Amino acid sequence: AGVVPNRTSSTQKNRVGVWYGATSNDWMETNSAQNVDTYFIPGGNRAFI
Amino acid sequence: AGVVPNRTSSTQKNRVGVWYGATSNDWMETNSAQNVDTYFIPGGNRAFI
């Protein structure tokens, strides 16, 4: 889209938001949970998408 | 709050929405999954809260 932050009034970093639709965290249930490490929650929770 | 559906303009059944904040599926992860049955998805998916 040719969008570079802070290039224009509408592309200022304080005027950009992100919405994502997710309904599963299978990674946490199955793959990441076979060994819980320091990045379990940051890397598995849907909040971080 | 004394909210009876359909008894006033602002409480008509089609004018009421539900918003919920959830961030876990522990039942699905551990308890409901020990024996998957007919109500696994309807009973463990956050969409049904």
Binding site: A1, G2, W27, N31, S32, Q34 | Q34, N35
Partner: peptide, 30 residues
């Protein structure tokens, strides 16, 4: 005017945590 140029040439690599030993079929057994 903005053209449709080729996407970034990412240096992709495989990062996977394989699900092993079929433990999902024994959820509750000793």
């Amino acid at each position: 005017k903005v053209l449709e140029l080729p996407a970034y040439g990412w240096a992709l690599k495989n990062y996977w945590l394989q699900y092993v030993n079929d433990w999902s079929l024994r959820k509750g057994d000793p």
